[PDB]
Amino acid sequence: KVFGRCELAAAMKRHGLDNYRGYSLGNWVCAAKFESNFNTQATNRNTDGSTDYGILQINSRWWCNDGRTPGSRNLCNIPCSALLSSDITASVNCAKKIVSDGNGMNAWVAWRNRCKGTDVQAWIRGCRL
Ligand SMILES: [Cl-]
Ligand SMILES: [Cl-]
């Protein structure tokens, strides 16, 4: 599923990501835009052999099992395919674990390089939330 910007903002806020661990909603929408272009089916191989999955490009080295990543912890206890569903619950629940583990949203490379320090609240402007 390719989400609309405001459609994704509303789903993220329903799951409680708005100001989760201090990160306002626009941070999460900005991160999803540049990680996946709002596409739940997005998959991208990483240089280290792992793969990133779903709307928030969650990585198979630590967080989900895809059966082909060597160092694979599966800390969210899910198959990586679960992160590709039209329902974003699994991705949100796993992202909450990731963002609570020390470096916050810096775990998302696209967030650090393209959202951090910018006007992230632009990503929810015009949305009825
Ligand atoms: Cl929209
Ligand atoms: Cl992509």
UniProtKB/Swiss-Prot annotation:
Show the SUPFAM superfamilies listed in the entry: Lysozyme-like
The answer to whether the entry has keyword Hydrolase is: yes
Subunit record text: Monomer.
Q: Please report which protein family the annotation says this sequence is part of.
A: Belongs to the glycosyl hydrolase 22 family.
The name under which this protein is listed is Lysozyme C
PANTHER family in alphabetical order? LYSOZYME C
The gene behind this protein is: LYZ
UniProt source species: Gallus gallus
Q: Which reaction does this chain catalyze?
A: Hydrolysis of (1->4)-beta-linkages between N-acetylmuramic acid and N-acetyl-D-glucosamine residues in a peptidoglycan and between N-acetyl-D-glucosamine residues in chitodextrins
